[PDB]
């Protein structure tokens, strides 16, 4: 949450979750994985969550650009909706698909965010604005986070 | 015919259908005043401003949409991403400029990722008087607000300093 204020509000985590990429790699905070590791879309584990609860998650990169201008912030990834607590985004809705990562300047981060749904049951990537659709799509603050840095290949 | 740049550039192919000028027009840039001159290559430190697009036919009672795009997006062995938009200005009069239309989509300065990138102007006459800039697509646009064929085009190559 310290590493991202620039992008959502301070949080409390209540609910754990892991991405794990595919020989298989899991995501650590803070840690850089080549673009070539990053290229198929990854399954991201959702440890908590009540019973009738439903999730959303979004991928974003806020360092474009590059992390030291960052004029076209954000540049948006990914969107899963309606995953229920305990499985993992496989069970959930496509809405906006994967784009693998492919940084122009620089080392970026790309950031994982969940959400807790009120209820079970277009988007332009460029520009893009998570507490801006998340306070449109009465969806709080995250419960979860975790990020990679990244950087292009030469 | 033979020695079309917009043939050789593959813009008619990837970007817009073969068509045959009507129009002539003039992109100059002032960020020494640089003219763009279709195929050659400038720098990214001097395509930072908006650049001026010179009407030079048509008539006072004729509108005229502008649009500039990139097709080689990321990088143009695999352009995956294409196009990426950078600017839309619409009901610039002819024989005037792009100062006197009307902004739609605001101007984006070149930027490209991996390789050369083609940076394209094009012009279209109009009949009558939002947008992802993500994934654009020239041809569909064109023909949802039936913008026929270009009346003109030209373009410039780019790569990261």
């Given at each position: 949450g310290r590493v991202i204020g620039d992008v959502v509000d301070h949080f409390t985590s209540t609910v754990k979750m892991s991405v794990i990429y595919n020989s298989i790699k899991h995501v650590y905070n803070g840690?850089?994985?080549?673009?070539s590791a990053v290229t198929?879309?990854?399954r991201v584990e959702v440890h908590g969550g009540d019973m009738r609860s439903f999730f959303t998650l979004i991928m974003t990169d806020p360092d474009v650009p590059g992390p030291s201008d960052p004029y076209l912030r954000e540049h948006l990834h990914w969107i899963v909706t309606d995953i229920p607590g305990t499985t993992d985004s496989s069970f959930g809705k496509e809405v906006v698909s994967y784009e693998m990562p492919r940084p122009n300047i620089g080392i970026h981060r790309f950031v994982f965010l969940l959400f807790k749904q009120?209820?079970?049951?277009?988007?332009?990537?460029d520009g893009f604005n998570t507490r801006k659709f998340t306070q449109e799509?009465?969806?709080?603050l995250p419960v979860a986070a975790v990020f990679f840095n990244c950087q292009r290949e030469t």
């Open positions: 840690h850089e994985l080549f673009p198929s879309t990854p009120k209820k079970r049951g277009v988007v332009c990537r799509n009465e969806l709080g």
